[PDB]
């Protein structure tokens, strides 16, 4: 096949001007979409913090209007999901992964409005879920929508545009143009057969969407940690050890997140009403906690800065950790719309700082700063639970900007994926397609 | 569908044998790459010290400069044409082939030929980079262990050949991320699926950087300081810069190729006019690396200086032309050694220029020419060799001005878009395709 190869090599990196332009459009749209989505969740958490001032005294009355508020939005969310678009529950990433393997339909006329508005619900009420879920799915749909509305033909476009939409969305979720692209080519793209996804394309989209996200959320970052110190070479072994711990814990967290999906199904049968009512029940539980101990609720983007600086005690950390494991399982497994990324960054930080503190007073001659350990572990859960180390590394990197810590971060995140492998854990995004897909065969 | 579920559940499972082997390939390329670096330092030491020897008599020194690079260049070209012909030029295009199983990996040959031979062309101070030597040297090291451990199967042979190449590109710039991104943007078989385990490639790159740092820690190749930021009303400027890089990118490809030709005529393919034409160009460079050093050498030393806005506009245009003229001469002539490094330098220098003009055309944008230099630094790599994603990340890992990510991406993309619409081709593919179609003609 040598003759054929020379023909191919000279035709490499040539993507039809039609796709390139359409990618520009998709990014632009996901961008605005993601921006608008963000504006909304802001607002809804704003009302909730404003209505808690309104009923300022009478403690038990307030503890009631916190719960009842998250509870009322969660419900509105689960309902909008189970009734109009079943396939929008959960994260949303496993569903786009399938769509690239052409094994799940991309019902955009449904999912766009259901996941958008429905997510505002579970996220506004302050549940422990991220943005990626909503946006990566939302994004890919936007990508299908324009493939459909411009009746574009061919395997290339349907894959490429469904991809760039998904990336643009993940970027706009963290202001991470690089991570968005790296994610598509580490976990989105069909992982076993070759696929005609044009990389230049995916880019043009991610860029447009980031430019959009910056037009509106400029002059303030999600995570600000300041320039941490450096990591001496005789310090590295420590980060391996951290990775190992992340590595035995990563599969375990997968067992639960899955086994919890089960245990919670028994509690409502598959019934719209015990679900929605079980929904506002968990949703409310969180909006209440987002007052009596806020570090156990919400996305988690707020406790990163605080925890990294070494402001929590060892006690408050261990608490925060357990409390979050127990609410992330509860919110994601229950099938409310919304990703597991963000909460996973939070758990990683918190666990990292813990390691960091213990490390700091075990070795004074290394002159550590627990904050670096919080930063190496931040993208470690993403590397042992999710099995997408390369995207995590760069995701952390684009949000905390402490490139001097690239070695540590890599080593920790690698120890993670090695130990997650040798203890039989599986990529939590695949294990979820594989379930949702083998359940489409075990009913014939 | 039944088959996919079977696959999904078995995803990201790379046989413990390969993973372990990747570790030793990295470790090996790391030490190798370090060793190589140490040598080139040394040989440039000597030349700088022997110029002190014969300190006065101007024309006598202008002679011992020339004759020195001339002597090492020759020693290089010879060691190449005699024992390992497939080690001349880059070396990246040859490993690309090896992944498509269309070129042999004569490690028992290339390892020592490219290593010692490169020392030669690089020590004499020619305008070529370290990536060529190391990416190739690296992959070979990768075959060597597949061979020496008789490892069986498609997976290993691809996987180890790749991690080796990466680890090598890393250690060349202390760029663990660029290394991996490069394999998955330009190294891996670009049209059929391939069983290259990423987790594997990583373990290797890591081991090798860890190695490179054990010896070259405490000092970075390019230091530019934290430059200012870039206002959103400024971006359109970086698109324009990308466009200029996008029309110039293919043209530089034409020459780089067309000069490969014009220089063959000058020696027929004959080992002696080659080697004598070698030390003639090699010598020309080591001479210039005195009467105007910014036109010679890899180029890593003029980045800092140019970015700070230390050159006048006149000295910039000069430095530019003079460099096009020597990068073409050195790479096209088929001396061992990549083209990356010289291309980063040319992008900087062209960027600064844009920058100055920009700075006094718009005083209300409050610009610093320095940022243009940094958006352009990886723009040649994005319009000449069509690997924007690796370029962006390669600049980024070496200048650390993440706040410029937007500009950088926009210039670099304006580059690959215009390189596309004015018909250029990935300079690394255009070189395989030539060397592969000359294999059947």
């Amino acid at each position, epitope marked *: 096949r040598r003759r054929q190869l020379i023909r191919q090599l000279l035709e490499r990196d040539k993507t039809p001007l039609a796709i390139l332009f359409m990618a520009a459009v998709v990014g632009t749209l996901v961008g605005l979409a993601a921006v608008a989505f963000d504006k909304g969740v802001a607002w809804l958490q704003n009302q909730r913090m404003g209505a808690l001032v309104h009923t300022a005294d009478n403690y038990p009355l307030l503890l009631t209007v916190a719960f009842l508020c998250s509870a009322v939005l969660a419900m509105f969310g689960y309902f909008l999901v189970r009734k109009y678009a079943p396939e929008a529950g959960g994260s949303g990433i496993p569903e786009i992964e399938g769509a690239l393997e052409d094994q799940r339909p991309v019902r955009w006329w449904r999912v766009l409005p259901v996941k958008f508005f429905g997510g505002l619900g579970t996220l506004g009420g302050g549940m422990v879920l991220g943005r990626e879920g909503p946006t990566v799915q939302i994004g890919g749909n936007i990508g299908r929508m324009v493939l459909d509305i411009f009746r574009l033909k061919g395997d290339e476009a349907r894959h490429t545009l469904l991809a760039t939409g998904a990336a643009a969305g993940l970027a706009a979720a963290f202001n991470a143009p690089l991570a968005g692209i790296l994610f598509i080519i580490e976990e989105m793209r069909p992982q076993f057969r070759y696929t005609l996804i044009s990389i230049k394309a995916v880019f043009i989209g991610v860029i447009m969407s980031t430019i959009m996200y910056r037009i509106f959320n400029h002059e303030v970052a999600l995570i600000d940690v300041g320039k941490l110190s450096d990591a001496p070479l005789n310090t590295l072994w420590l980060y391996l050890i951290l990775g190992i711990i992340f590595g035995i814990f990563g599969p375990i967290f997968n067992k639960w997140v899955l086994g919890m999906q089960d245990l919670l199904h028994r509690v409502h049968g598959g019934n719209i009403t015990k679900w929605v009512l079980m929904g506002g029940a968990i949703g409310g539980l969180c909006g209440l906690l987002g007052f009596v101990a806020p570090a156990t609720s919400g996305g988690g983007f707020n406790l990163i800065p605080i925890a990294t600086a070494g402001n929590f005690s060892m006690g408050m950390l261990v608490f925060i950790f357990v409390a979050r494991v127990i609410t992330t399982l509860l919110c994601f497994s229950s099938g409310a719309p919304g990703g597991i990324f963000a909460p996973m960054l939070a758990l990683g930080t918190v666990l990292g700082t813990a390691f960091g503190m213990v490390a700091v007073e075990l070795f004074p001659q290394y002159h550590l700063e627990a904050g670096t350990f919080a930063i190496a572990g931040m993208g470690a859960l993403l590397a042992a639970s999710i099995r997408a180390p390369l995207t995590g590394i760069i995701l952390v990197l684009e949000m905390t900007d402490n490139y001097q810590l690239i070695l540590p971060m890599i080593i920790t995140g690698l120890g993670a994926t090695l130990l997650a492998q040798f203890t039989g854990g599986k990529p939590l995004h695949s294990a979820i397609l594989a379930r949702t897909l083998a359940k489409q065969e075990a009913e014939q | 569908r039944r088959q996919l579920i079977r696959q999904l559940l078995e995803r990201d499972k790379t046989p413990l044998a390969i993973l372990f082997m990747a570790a030793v390939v990295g470790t090996l390329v790391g030490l190798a790459a370090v060793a190589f670096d140490k040598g080139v330092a040394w040989l440039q030491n000597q030349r700088m010290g022997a110029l002190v020897h014969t300190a006065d008599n101007y024309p006598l020194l202008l002679t011992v400069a020339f004759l020195c690079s001339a002597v090492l260049a020759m020693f290089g070209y010879f060691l190449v044409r005699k024992y390992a012909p497939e080690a001349g030029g880059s070396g990246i295009p040859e490993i690309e082939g090896a992944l498509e199983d269309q070129r042999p990996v004569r490690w028992w040959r290339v390892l020592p030929v490219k290593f010692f031979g490169g020392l030669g062309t690089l020590g004499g101070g020619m305008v070529l980079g370290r990536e060529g030597p190391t990416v190739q040297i690296g992959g070979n090291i990768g075959r060597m262990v597949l061979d020496i451990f008789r490892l069986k199967g498609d997976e290993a042979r691809h996987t180890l050949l790749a991690t080796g190449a990466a680890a090598g590109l890393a250690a060349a710039f202390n760029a663990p991320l660029a290394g991996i991104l490069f394999i998955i943007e330009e190294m891996r078989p670009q049209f059929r699926y391939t069983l290259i385990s990423i987790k594997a490639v990583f373990i290797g790159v890591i081991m090798s950087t860890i190695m490179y740092r054990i010896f070259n820690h405490e000092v970075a190749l390019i230091d530019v300081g934290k430059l*200012s930021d870039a*206002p959103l*009303n400024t971006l359109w400027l970086y698109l324009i810069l990308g466009i200029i890089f996008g029309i110039f990118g293919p043209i530089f490809n034409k020459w780089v190729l067309g000069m490969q030709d014009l220089l063959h005529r000058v020696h027929g393919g004959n080992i002696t006019k080659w080697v004598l034409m070698g030390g003639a160009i090699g010598g020309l460079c080591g001479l210039l690396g005195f009467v105007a050093p910014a036109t010679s050498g890899g180029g890593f030393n003029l980045i800092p200086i140019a970015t700070a806005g230390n050159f006048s506009m006149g000295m910039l245009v000069f430095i530019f032309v003079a460099r096009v003229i020597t990068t073409l001469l050195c790479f096209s002539s088929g001396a061992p050694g990549g083209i990356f490094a010289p291309m980063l330098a040319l992008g900087t220098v062209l960027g600064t220029a844009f920058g100055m003009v920009a700075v006094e055309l718009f005083p*209300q944008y*409050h610009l*610093e020419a320095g940022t243009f230099a940094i958006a352009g630094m990886g723009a040649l790599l994005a319009a000449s060799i069509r690997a924007p994603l690796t370029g962006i990340i390669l600049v980024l890992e070496m200048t650390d001005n993440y706040q410029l990510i937007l500009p950088m991406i926009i210039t670099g993309l304006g580059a690959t878009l215009l390189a596309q619409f004015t018909g250029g081709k990935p300079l690394h593919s255009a070189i395989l395709a030539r060397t592969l179609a000359k294999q059947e003609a």
Partner: antibody
Amino acid sequence: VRLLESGGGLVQPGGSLKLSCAASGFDYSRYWMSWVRQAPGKGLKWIGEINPVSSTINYTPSLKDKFIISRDNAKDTLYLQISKVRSEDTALYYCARLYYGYGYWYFDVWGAGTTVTVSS
Amino acid sequence: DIVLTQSPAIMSAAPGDKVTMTCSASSSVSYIHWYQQKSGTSPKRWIYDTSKLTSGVPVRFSGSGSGTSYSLTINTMEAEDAATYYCQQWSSHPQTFGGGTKLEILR
């Protein structure tokens, strides 16, 4: 975060004087700095700006060495030299730290003022 | 260089009143900024990029315009708004301030 200008008061007409603004509570790199003046009971007139690496220093349309804006990032301090002082320069000088949104620069955090009085 | 000119030079109004001052420009400016100078205080960044509010500027305050016309608008004025307001543009070099509207209160 606070700017504290000083060193005004009396000058002989045709004389000259060094105002030193002095900064604290923010990385005094990272910023362009600027001066502006308010003659008594009147509007605002920009004198000049200057970046962090003292590489670029612009002035208002005015004469050859009328003003000299300089800064020294060791002491966290901006300076201003006025020369051959006519009575138009009788004013309050503000120093102000510079910045931007979409991109058009604005005078961000202003100092407190110093007064200059040109008289015999 | 650009000559910005401000409309009411002095304007009385009683708290409650919706209030609008104006900044007009001889050429084409964009993204103008506004300062509030109270008595014997220094100018304070008030509204920037035509309609963004500096942090902790009461939401009664708003800005807009484009081209040659720009206005800052107090919506239900309040007595503590008694100040002198400068507009300022930096869209063309060198930058330039207005003459300043002086707000005055009627009580």
